[PDB]
Structures are given as structure tokens and as C-alpha cells.
Design a protein around this ligand. Structure first.
Ligand SMILES: *[C@@H]1O[C@H](CO)[C@@H](O)[C@H](O)[C@H]1NC(C)=O
Ligand SMILES: *[C@@H]1O[C@H](CO)[C@@H](O)[C@H](O)[C@H]1NC(C)=O
Ligand SMILES: *[C@@H]1O[C@H](CO)[C@@H](O)[C@H](O)[C@H]1NC(C)=O
Ligand SMILES: *[C@@H]1O[C@H](CO)[C@@H](O)[C@H](O)[C@H]1NC(C)=O
Ligand SMILES: *[C@@H]1O[C@H](CO)[C@@H](O)[C@H](O)[C@H]1NC(C)=O
Ligand SMILES: *[C@@H]1O[C@H](CO)[C@@H](O)[C@H](O)[C@H]1NC(C)=O
Ligand SMILES: [Zn+2]
Ligand SMILES: [Zn+2]
Ligand SMILES: [Zn+2]
Ligand SMILES: [Zn+2]
Ligand SMILES: [Zn+2]
Ligand SMILES: [Zn+2]
Ligand SMILES: [Zn+2]
Ligand SMILES: [Zn+2]
Ligand SMILES: [Zn+2]
Ligand SMILES: [Zn+2]
Ligand SMILES: [Zn+2]
Ligand SMILES: [Zn+2]
Ligand SMILES: [Zn+2]
Ligand SMILES: [Zn+2]
Lengths: 301, 301
């Protein structure tokens, strides 16, 4: 394979045969595990994927470790999970339950892996210097076709190293507990309902999640219940989340108890329970949060 | 300007001189106003920007009108605003307060305006037919460089019309009430604090929003208050949102009242108020939602 044109002076020849220039960063991904690699003067340095441009939190605005674990799950991006305030947060270590350290995220708390260009899929380097101005995100500037690119080193004017910034990706398939594969936007009727039928949609939410909705009516009050799932794959474990809304018809009355959708049983806030559904043991919990919010995860060994 | 190679048979020569093929769609944007244009056999047809791949809501899963108005503001994407359940929703008409019709969004409730390629910035056409398979999102397939593209017509195998899908954009600047411009990630200390000092960050949230945080400690309890702002521009009006958290040290006790950050006054749920700050009249409201949530908008004429 040929080698880049200097500057920068110095190259890294990686295990796969790919040649990166000094100052470049790229992602080494093994199954679901991710490493952030750097081409230093003496060779390749790999470490925990750190994502910057954070603020607040108990960690003095330290960078994210992406992915991170929290509440038995893995998060590949910042989340609002666990928060009533809607703020996107991330763990500053790989294990949140252990270390308990976090920061809040901004529109720049992401790593952009480039395509095409000079850089062999290297990450964007921010800030990159172009026309004597520092760009902290991808630009259309200097291009007739208006395509969004970035420098893959600190100085593009000098190094001429770049790549194109693609649209962010998400999983395209929702796989049902019955093994049925659907695409984002597909609709079907729920396979295992509590007499009260449900309408399903493959929503995605970057994890191939599907949501099932059931509408109840007494002409005075309208009870709306929804359950969201995802099946396990290489990146994600199974998860289940149910809500219940009690609206006058709308005007919402808080729902402070949970109803498991596959049993029909009523649980109170702070209650845990187990269920065997479709040949798998689940552990459940009732949060409430005025929306009858309950979660389930498969029983772990 | 030259004309495309058929198929498709037939072309549209637009006001700007741009030539689109029959079956193509593009966005005509006038200031903050947006139109969705189609190249039909007889010419150009424009209408309200409709975004599909929705589900649920009181409208039978009708498409989004993007942008839409809700609660005195304009939304260019789906929002969770107003919802305690975190579900992304959109209005099915341009005015929500009037028509009250909505759908819920999926990972496909977006319109992707292409760059480069054959198509002059045309929107992605989903599904597009490639290698006798229908693609409902951008692909890496058929490309060595792994760049993400889409067909800009129903049949790419036949029409050969495509464009590249760029990374989604957001506003890069947070402009302060004092007129100070910051970039996403910049930090500063708040200009007008209630004795209790605040640390600011230019967060973005696709609207150049900046959040100010103040930490209070009694060693037993930790009160955390945050205020989020954006100044007016061509796309967005001014908005202000404050929260207050009361955590033991964490374990949260719900905060069911509001404290205006620029006055220090305590308001209860369902209370409205006015304030004159930095030479502008504001109308305010106390929602609570266990997080002392209050919003302000400038007084309208
Ligand atoms: C550009 O950024 C680098 C550090 O990111 C800084 O050292 C340099 O002073 C900046 N210069 C310009 C031209 O903005
Ligand atoms: C998915 O989960 C089932 C356990 O219910 C397990 O047997 C299977 O090996 C898992 N496979 C994948 C693709 O993770
Ligand atoms: C909804 O409200 C009615 C009274 O307002 C109450 O009886 C009912 O329990 C609430 N929800 C359910 C699950 O019935
Ligand atoms: C592809 O999609 C079009 C409608 O979107 C449909 O009419 C056609 O049958 C589909 N065919 C294939 C090959 O998937
Ligand atoms: C922004 O708001 C101020 C009113 O406070 C108004 O005078 C000014 O014209 C507005 N300008 C823009 C750029 O929208
Ligand atoms: C936080 O909790 C303490 C008692 O637990 C309460 O006195 C205090 O009012 C709460 N918040 C504030 C704003 O003081
Ligand atoms: Zn070399
Ligand atoms: Zn909010
Ligand atoms: Zn940006
Ligand atoms: Zn079954
Ligand atoms: Zn998955
Ligand atoms: Zn819900
Ligand atoms: Zn959960
Ligand atoms: Zn022609
Ligand atoms: Zn939730
Ligand atoms: Zn997709
Ligand atoms: Zn001032
Ligand atoms: Zn704006
Ligand atoms: Zn907050
Ligand atoms: Zn508001």
C-alpha cells in the first residue's frame, strides 16, 4: 500500500495495512468494543474512546467514555436516561455504577469518523486550521459542491489531510421476540396482547426499538399505554419499557403505579418483580414518574 | 446550464436556473419559510414541507409539517417539548395551537438534502431501487470509499440519479443577551447573577442554546439550578427555561415551585408573571414537573 504525502512527517502502518499520518486519530472497533487510536511520532497509541466538549456534572466537565455502561445497559451516545430534566449526559468512565462520574453533553460531544478523502476513515480533528481560521465542526467552505468535510489533523492549510462527514447511522431493523424482522416505519399488530390489542411500530431510537400502543376509552377518560422493546444483538441487550397515560377528553392526571403488559398485574413505586415471557426470565421495576413507567431487563447470570 | 441525462424523461428548469429530473424533490427555502417542491411531468409543484415515517398520535400517523409552531415557538425537527414520556412528536399541520393534530416520530422522520453527486442538492428519494433492492435510508453499498449516498428518484438502477448524505447541521454560535458570541463548548461566568454566581456553556441543542448552572451546598442538601437561553435570529425567537434540583448528598426530592433567576421570586404551579430584563418585556409560567420548571418568552405585539 502507498504512503501519504508530507506534512505531517512520519507515518503509522497499522495491523490492517492502513497508513495514518502523525497527529491523526481513528477508531479501532472489536465486535462492540471501541478504541481511540493516535499516530504519535514513535508509533500507535490506543486508549478508552474519550469524547470532549462536555460541561457540568460531578466530574468538572471531564470527557465521555463512549460507549459506557449504566443501569445494566450500554450507551453508544449521550443519553437522557434516568433524568427528569431532559439533559443529555454521559459517564466519564466506562462503568457508571462503579465510578459514578458524569458530564453533560453539547452538540459537539460526538466523534466524527470520516469517509472518502485523503484520510482512510480517520476521525475529524477539531479544531482544524483552514484559510487561517479554526473550524470546530465540519464545513462547506472552500467547496463548490457544498459537501461537508473536515481536516484530519490540526493544520489543513499545511497538511492537506481531510475526509467527508457522513450522515450519522442507526440500526435499520427491529427484530421481534418472535424473530420477525421489520424496517424503521413498519407497522404490525402485537403478537402477545392482554386481550386489549396493540399496534406496533419499528421506531428505531438508534437501537432498533419498536413501540406498541393500546388505546382505551370510557368517553370521559382515555387510557393510553405503550411498551418499547429491542432484542439482543452484538451491541445491545434486551430492554423493555412501559408507560401509561390517563388523559381527560387532553388533560393528564399522573399515573403513579405500573401495570405489567404481559401479566396485567399492578405494581407500586419501588416494587421489583420477575416474569417468564416467551422462554426468558426478566427482572422488572416500577419507577412511576407520573407516567406509570416500568422497565424490565433479562435476568443475568 | 446543461440538462440531465435520461431516464427520467422530462426536466424542470427552476427560477434559479437549476434543472431537476421528473420524480425529484428539493427544498425551496425563503428566509425561515420552507417549501417541498416536486418535478412532475407538466412542471414544478410546491407545498407545505411534509415529513413521513410517523406513527400514533391523534392524526392516524399523518406526516409532519416541518417546521411547525407550538406554544409560541417554531420547531424545525421533532420535539419532546411538552411531554413527560420522552417521545419525539411533530405537528401534522403548520399551526399546532389552532389544529391540535400530531404524530410520533421514528429515526426516518427527517428529510435528507443531498450534496455533490448528479442531483443538484435534491432530497433523497425513499425507497430508491438499487441492485434490485429498495433502500429506505442512505447506503455505503456499491462504493469502495464507503461514502453514504442515496438515489434521488424511485429507481437508481434505471435513472442513475444520486447525491451524498451529509452530517446534520446545527447553529454554531450562542449569542448572549449582551450580544457576546460564543462557539459550542465555550464557557464563561454569567453576566447578570442573583448574588449566587453561574457558570455558562454554549451547548447548542440545534438552536445555539447556552445553559447557566449554580451549585448550592448546606453539606446535607445540594440545590442545583440551571437556566437555558437562546437569542433571536432568522429561525428562532428568544426562549428561557429554568430548573431547580434538590438532591441529598444523589437522592432527589421533587421541587414543586419556581424561582425566577433574574428576580429571585417564588411562583407556584399554574402561576404566570412578567419581567423586564435587559430592556425586554417577558411573559413567564411555572410548570413545576418536579424540577421547578419555568419558561419565559418575550411579550408579543
Ligand atoms: C487555532 O487553534 C489552535 C489550538 O486549537 C490555537 O493554538 C491557535 O492559536 C488557533 N489559531 C487561530 C488562527 O485561530
Ligand atoms: C440473544 O439472546 C439469546 C438469549 O435469550 C441468546 O441465546 C442468544 O445467543 C443471543 N444472541 C445474540 C445474537 O446476541
Ligand atoms: C384515570 O382517572 C380516573 C378518575 O379520574 C381514575 O378513576 C382512573 O383510575 C385513572 N386511571 C385508571 C387506570 O383508571
Ligand atoms: C420497491 O418499492 C416499490 C414501492 O416503494 C414497490 O412498488 C416495489 O414493489 C418494491 N420492489 C422491490 C424490488 O423491493
Ligand atoms: C432580535 O430581537 C430584537 C428585539 O429585542 C429586535 O429588535 C431585533 O430586530 C431582532 N433581530 C433579529 C436578528 O431577529
Ligand atoms: C430541599 O429539601 C429540604 C428538606 O429536605 C427543604 O427544606 C428544602 O426546602 C428543599 N429545597 C429548598 C429550595 O430548600
Ligand atoms: Zn512512510
Ligand atoms: Zn425542558
Ligand atoms: Zn457544530
Ligand atoms: Zn410468542
Ligand atoms: Zn441493536
Ligand atoms: Zn410512552
Ligand atoms: Zn431500563
Ligand atoms: Zn431538458
Ligand atoms: Zn423513558
Ligand atoms: Zn435509517
Ligand atoms: Zn446586561
Ligand atoms: Zn437560532
Ligand atoms: Zn436543568
Ligand atoms: Zn417554553
Amino acid at each position: 500500500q502507498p504512503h501519504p504525502q508530507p506534512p505531517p512527517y512520519g507515518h503509522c502502518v497499522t495491523d490492517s495495512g492502513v497508513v495514518y499520518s502523525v497527529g491523526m486519530q481513528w477508531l479501532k472497533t472489536q465486535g462492540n468494543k471501541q478504541m481511540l487510536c493516535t499516530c504519535l511520532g514513535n508509533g500507535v497509541s490506543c486508549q478508552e474512546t474519550a469524547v470532549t466538549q462536555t460541561y457540568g456534572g460531578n466530574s468538572n466537565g471531564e470527557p465521555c467514555v463512549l460507549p459506557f455502561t449504566y443501569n445494566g445497559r450500554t450507551f453508544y451516545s449521550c443519553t437522557t436516561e434516568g433524568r427528569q430534566d431532559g439533559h443529555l449526559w454521559c459517564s466519564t468512565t466506562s462503568n457508571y455504577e462503579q465510578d459514578q462520574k458524569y458530564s453533560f453533553c453539547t452538540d459537539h460531544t460526538v466523534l466524527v469518523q470520516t469517509r472518502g478523502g485523503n484520510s482512510n476513515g480517520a476521525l475529524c480533528h477539531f479544531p482544524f486550521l483552514y484559510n487561517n481560521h479554526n473550524y470546530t465542526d465540519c464545513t462547506s467552505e472552500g467547496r463548490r459542491d457544498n459537501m461537508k468535510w473536515c481536516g484530519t489533523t490540526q493544520n489543513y492549510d499545511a497538511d492537506q489531510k481531510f475526509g467527508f462527514c457522513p450522515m450519522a447511522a442507526h440500526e435499520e431493523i427491529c427484530t421481534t421476540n418472535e424473530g420477525v424482522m421489520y424496517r424503521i416505519g413498519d407497522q404490525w399488530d402485537k403478537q402477545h396482547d392482554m386481550g386489549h390489542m396493540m399496534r406496533c411500530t419499528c421506531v428505531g431510537n438508534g437501537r432498533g426499538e419498536w413501540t406498541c400502543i393500546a388505546y382505551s376509552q370510557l368517553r370521559d377518560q382515555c387510557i393510553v399505554d405503550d411498551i418499547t422493546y429491542n432484542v439482543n444483538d452484538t451491541f445491545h441487550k434486551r430492554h423493555e419499557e412501559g408507560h401509561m397515560l390517563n388523559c381527560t377528553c387532553w388533560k393528564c392526571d399522573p399515573v403513579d403505579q405500573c401495570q405489567d403488559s404481559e401479566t396485567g398485574t399492578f405494581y407500586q413505586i419501588g416494587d421489583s418483580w420477575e416474569k417468564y415471557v416467551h422462554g426468558v426470565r426478566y427482572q422488572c421495576y416500577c419507577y412511576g414518574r407520573g407516567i406509570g413507567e416500568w422497565h424490565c431487563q433479562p435476568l443475568q447470570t
